[model samples]
Target: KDYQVAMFGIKSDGVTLNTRSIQRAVDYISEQGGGRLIFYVGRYLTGSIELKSNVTIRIEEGAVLVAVPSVYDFKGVGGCNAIIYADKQKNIGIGGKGIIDGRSIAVRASVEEQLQKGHIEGNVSDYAPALICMEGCEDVKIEQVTLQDAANVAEIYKDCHNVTVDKVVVNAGASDRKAISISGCDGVKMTDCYFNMAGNPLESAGTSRNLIFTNCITPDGKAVS
Candidate 1:
């Protein structure tokens, strides 16, 4: 079964914080044997949200999940902060033709302010947060989504297995960060993706194995391996 985020009183006004309500919806869906948490067309503003096992986030076309610009709105997990985080999970997915905008320009400014005031520790890069970060997960799938302007990397998958990424679009704009960074992962496949990042399209490290990349495109219409 699937559930609408509005069912949990998650507002799509783009100003009201939907962090807690979104988390509640995710938790409820996971506890009920898991299903997709669907978001329709709107600007859904939120802080950090964690993905759980057997749950998929399906953002429909015209929907935009906009990350709040405050560093305080995020929670650090798996050695990184992100708008969406998952750790030690299984059967998780995020898909559909929607946009996830990090609004990094404003976020970076907020982070620098907090760093200067000693309200937070670490460099701006450390606090800026990725769009999606996952660790120690298995059987993951992400497809057909647009991720743009992440404060840090667009997506990071660490120590995961059996991951598939397909038909995704990364428009990093002026942000100099990897579109996708993977480490210590195995059995990964990426296909038919497009990257227009200022930095590397894909980066891998830390003893990964059995990876495959095919038909992915770079900013200049060049095919990348």
Candidate 2:
């Protein structure tokens, strides 16, 4: 059975300590065969949030998901490249006119706290990838989502193919923006979407190709490659 529930504020009501928050929730989904983990349309101030197979984590429209410094890196879970991961999932999705605060917590500093504090105020790579990166997976669909304030790459891939990032709104800071990277894949069509990066966006590693970047705008103030 597909579970339809929400993980509230790193809960302390469970049997074990279980992180009891964003970390806990993301962990629980993977443990429970992966289902729909709904955001419930609210403001959550915390760290990293990971996703699993068959889980269509949806954020209700007009809601805000705030990413804080305390919990950023999807701790304990190994090999995570995106904020909301869909690595194992065959078909993952994100839509419904909601808002996601990339929370590029910070760029660089001393300790984790100082780094998250000092760098938090600037554009950073808090979460390595943005929106979704279905690496080594198939039949992934990321449609009708709005992403902004990313540090490294908005949507990244290592060996993903047959994917579609349709009608997405990607806005990055005007300084260092490497928005989208399609690597080691085929059959990728990024159309009718808007890409707002800085002056230069890096291309994928030599092993990636067969892509389409059409009907997008950089604005009159848009930077060049």
- Could you estimate the TM-score for every candidate? 0.96, 0.69
Model 2 lDDT tens row, 1-225 = 333334344322322222235555555665776655555555544344555555566655755554333334433224445556555556555654565565554521112453456643433344343534556766666766667665346676557667776777777753265777666867676666766653444457768667665665565444322
Question: What alpha-carbon RMSD in Å does predicted model 1 have with respect to the real structure?
Answer: 1.3
Clashing residue pairs, backbone N/CA/C < 3 A, model 2? 10-20, 10-21, 11-20, 47-71, 47-72, 48-71, 48-72, 105-120, 106-119
Candidate 1 TM-score over all chains jointly: 0.96
* Cα lDDT of model 1 by residue, 3-107, tens digit: 988899998888999999999999999999999999988999999899999999988899999999888898752375788889899999999899989999998
User: Highest TM-score: which candidate?
Assistant: 1
- In model 1, the runs with Cα more than 4 Å from the true position are none
